[PDB]
Subunit: 342 residues, 4 copies
């Protein structure tokens, strides 16, 4: 296969922990430049690949190094600005979430993606996580019937203050975290988003966000998310029209509840379920989705088709984010005037 | 202690499986009559206690046998009609849920309870279940802070048709099942019910009900319930203002997530939680709540105080049931006219 | 219908009050007609449930004054042994909590007395009658399970850490108070005569850890880990069969069953397994075995058949127990002899 | 900064491609400079990641033509043994997958060669370096844990069910392919010299079940259950300490830690325990041990120190392995001799 030539931007924590390692073990791709404002961070790639250029700004990299793609892991502002620059030069663009800070910015990125006709992508790794893929495959099987209801629980401890210079801690949380689980909702909903209701509770610097979504397919989704928890954890469920209930705990173990489940020593006795977890030595970046999201991005480049987590795919997710922030602004407003008056 | 004299009504399945066994091992109470339309069912109590009267109708029992209390496990219609009769005779009344079929009937029972000044009770065993009690005790402890959010998941497979001659399968499900988990919501909400939103999805003869509740205390509750599942199961969670998350799975095991949990061999290392489950030989009727609900009912009689699950305590639960049925009737109506027209 | 079996209770302490008595109280067609205890106030506790029945402070007096068909005892083995012989000579059926006696030779006297008297004798070997143990035993008798090759038993406790009932040995006390249960489970699943036993004990302060391996003529092997070197009582076990089936039972609660080629309808595959646990409202005394051990004991009386946990049934377990104590004393004798040699 | 360590790969089959190679590719400051395989097309698979580097179909040729500091092998023990001696005589550091050889006597030749050549030698004993095993080992070195009294190891597999690498024995093949890992864990936690070993093997068709017990001079005992009589590879282990602490590690994933007087802030008590598992996005090769085994091997090269899984470190495990095969052949010799006597 022809080698895909990749330039890296923002060699910080998520680049070093997850993306770079995935790229390093990724077939038929070559990393040919690294860029970071702090050039010493860029040179971290020399620990793996000697000699390749390190640059302190993206424009220099785009001008000196021939590239089929850039993979970026920085702030929304980086992804937005340089994202547009890279696309304007005909380079395919993969960025960590969030791709940008606003719906209107996303619409700008979408429009540029279409005009430049390049493959775009966002690092929505939950979508590509092996156990999530397995669940998605279940929804395609006849005996599962239809997905009626999706429940998502997404715990985190931060952010407890605004990020990237945004005024709002809620908007920061939605873009830093909930973006993942809202997108999972849109993914399993499978059909057009038809209604969104939501609410936000605050306590000190902590948040609990509840969002409910209905889809044209008839399916509903409910998300509990926030920063009022000790650490990042994630659990989801699916309820199907054939009375199948599927639970995925921590992207690790699956529990499958269905009428008339059996084992051979017992036959179909009341209350048997199926359970599944990985083997003890499960490793790499598939279970977590980093491998999958990059692999498919590159594939979409090879066959010049759409990448499933391109900018446009995020359109419904940004609408939900916007709606969650608008409703909260109204709620806050009313409560503030209430008090001001009483 | 003086012996409390108890008459039983409706010696069917739930009486034989749970209540009668709890009464039989209950200190200082005496069963002194059994009543059932099918006298052979009433005589099932002769398997345990010889000679005591068996009657085929409640009025006969109230006229011939001196009683401090009746415990009933039949249809709502039995509980309502004979409930009022027993109270009119100055007898304390314990009935299985549902105590009746409508808000207006509950209001009638409440008013009679107050006029007769007797102890009333409903067999809301989830409230009294040992693990639920443990959770409630946690909410009373300073380091827990306040309960911000309560999540309840209540799976069942039935009813898939209307019960007790009601027109509505939804109302049957709400009274047969969800009554338990809605009441748990009101219990942990602790404060006045301030808003209720809800939705009902149908598929064939199966239902998925989603209800959200907000309390004056600031706390919110979300319930997922229905008959679109293989068997009865129940999971709940609490999110507290101190970033404590508490999970109770199947009234069996508890998981307690909190900042800086430790073990002695490790110190407070990232991602340690507390877990708790009963010992292997856990038995009787405490874990499940049947013991507790009856014990406290009898106690309320001894000290002539209120029983915590008396008729009045169910007032907010019936309001939610009514609201869920009203909203569904509107939704159905609109969808029916939509089609009729298109 | 059925005739009432008349039962006297001896030893109204903790195990009588927590499990046995409650079980008896809900048992069809038996009457508790007398309670006997050294401490007449303990005997009187029955009056919380059943008025007027005679209380005695010694077994001889109860046997003279009250017509009885069976006694049920929960005291020390000295009481089980002596009063159990006395009740049997008067043609009374005898049920005793473990342990029935302190020594193998005692057990042999018991066995002999019970054969000559032609009464039903029984020991409260409740693990053996526990509903999930029954489910495990049932799989074992099914062709596709194949043969049971290996049985792993893990029995944890925190006591006794001092000798019991005036015995000299903390090891003998532990084996008689705790391990007896799991040694007997091993015999029960081994199914075949005991061919070989190896054991060892490790001591640390007042705590111990016993390991014992058993081989059976059926080819099956068993391995047991038990001691007091733990925080609390817990129990897990495993079965390995010749169809490559592994069955795990954790705390008499959940069952995991691993077998080649397990499936779900939505996935058709590797690493799928079966899981089972009771419903949330599981209650009474079946799961723990107290109900079944008693119910079978009474059935055996009515049908004049052998009760499966009679004194004889315990012979192999007391053999194992002797062999562990002998071996240990030799290991101890050596270590001490090695030391006064240094 | 650091000098680049130059690595040749030998044996580009499944374990090289799934774990070792990906680990090497993300390893700071090492360069893969050659790949060697009988099947040049397998060798060429490296070119999916690193262009142009020489491919050879034999180790001798690679050692002549390419300057190397270390080789990393993943082939049969015959290859590890012979080519491992060859690489060591040329002053090349040698890392090989298990097993490093087929026999104890081979291992001794390896140990001797490695001492004379003064190079770092190593075996891919990855369980030992697995992050959760490290956590367990760390608790063990902490005063309050007390001493480790007992170690229980359960190692399940479905293969091999036929002899491997032209060996005659399916038992030797299994011990060398699988149990080697868990025998070595036992040695590692036993901490003290091996005092005693007992074992037994049971056969059923083409499957086996090995039990082995080990005692150590530190007082610690170990008990291991391993075989092929199971659906799939799984692994769980337990530590019992003298502070009455029990630690369980299930499938290198979750840790349960039982200790007297555990607590939560909201409950202050009996039956509380600690639990731990990784976050949902846990990835790479640390958890499984491939990362750490390699990283330490390279660190040992740089510091010219001993690598903890060198050939010598494996001596006790190969001793155990011989003793299990000897014992088994005697047990077999007897059963057959008993039979031609019948
Ligand atoms: N999908 C996942 O699971 C998840 C996990 C972690 C973070 N993320 C995302 O990854 C991204 C990066 O976060 P991080 O935690 O590694 O933070 P970081 O501060 O450690 O890394 C960001 C890097 O970008 C660089 N950068 C900033 N602007 C630049 C510019 N104009 N040109 C070149 N370099 C520039 C920084 O100097 C830095 O080294 C985010 O958008 C974040 O939300 C994804
Ligand atoms: N709380 C729990 O967990 C839960 C579990 C099971 C059922 N319940 C409740 O228990 C109650 C009884 O249900 P059941 O399942 O045992 O059904 P059932 O049909 O088996 O028992 C009802 C009994 O009441 C009798 N009855 C009816 N009307 C009577 C009358 N006018 N006078 C005397 N007897 C009369 C019947 O003949 C019968 O034997 C309900 O209201 C039900 O919803 C509670
Ligand atoms: N493992 C289990 O299945 C379960 C658990 C605990 C106890 N056991 C068994 O039950 C028995 C009692 O245990 P416990 O924990 O309830 O202790 P306990 O405090 O209940 O003592 C039992 C009773 O027997 C009485 N007694 C002693 N000698 C008597 C005599 N000569 N005549 C009449 N009464 C006499 C005592 O006064 C006392 O009230 C034991 O043998 C024990 O191992 C069963
Ligand atoms: N348990 C674990 O930690 C993990 C798991 C599986 C395998 N292992 C070990 O890794 C090794 C290989 O296992 P595999 O499953 O990857 O099988 P495999 O299909 O990968 O075979 C390994 C490779 O070595 C090559 N080879 C054989 N002899 C050679 C020679 N003389 N010169 C050059 N190349 C030669 C083969 O052609 C082949 O491509 C074993 O010794 C095994 O036990 C590690």
């Amino acid at each position: 296969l022809s080698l895909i030539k990749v330039g890296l931007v923002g060699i910080g924590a998520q680049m070093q922990e997850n993306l770079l390692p995935s790229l390093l073990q990724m077939q038929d791709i070559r990393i040919v430049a690294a860029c970071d404002s702090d050039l010493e961070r860029a040179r971290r790639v020399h620990r793996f690949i000697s000699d390749i250029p390190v640059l302190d700004n993206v424009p220099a990299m785009l001008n000196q190094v021939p590239l089929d793609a850039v993979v970026m892991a920085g702030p929304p502002q980086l992804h937005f600005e340089m994202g547009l620059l890279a696309m304007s030069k005909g380079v395919n663009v993969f960025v960590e979430k969030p791709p940008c800070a606003t719906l209107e910015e996303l619409e700008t990125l979408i429009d540029a993606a279409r005009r430049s006709d390049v493959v775009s992508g966002v690092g929505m790794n939950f979508k590509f996580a092996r156990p999530v893929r397995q669940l998605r495959e279940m929804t395609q099987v006849d005996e599962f019937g239809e997905t009626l209801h999706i429940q998502l629980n997404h715990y985190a401890n931060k952010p407890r203050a605004p990020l990237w210079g945004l005024d709002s801690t809620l908007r920061s949380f939605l873009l830093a975290q909930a973006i993942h689980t809202i997108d999972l909702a849109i993914t399993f909903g499978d059909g057009e988003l038809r209604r969104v209701q939501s609410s936000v509770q605050r306590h000190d610097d902590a948040l609990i966000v509840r969002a409910d979504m209905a889809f044209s397919s008839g399916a509903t989704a409910s998300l509990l998310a926030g920063t009022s928890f000790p650490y990042f954890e994630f659990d989801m469920k699916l309820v199907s029209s054939s009375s199948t209930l599927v639970e995925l705990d921590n992207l690790w173990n699956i529990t499958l509840h269905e009428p008339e489940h059996a084992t051979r020593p017992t036959g179909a006795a009341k209350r048997w379920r199926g359970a599944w977890q990985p083997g003890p030595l499960d490793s790499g970046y598939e279970r977590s989705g980093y491998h999958g999201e990059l692999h498919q991005f590159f594939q979409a480049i090879r066959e010049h088709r759409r990448f499933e987590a391109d900018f446009a795919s995020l359109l419904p997710t940004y609408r939900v984010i916007e709606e969650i922030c608008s409703a909260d602004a109204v709620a806050q407003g009313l409560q503030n005037a209430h008090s001001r008056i009483r």
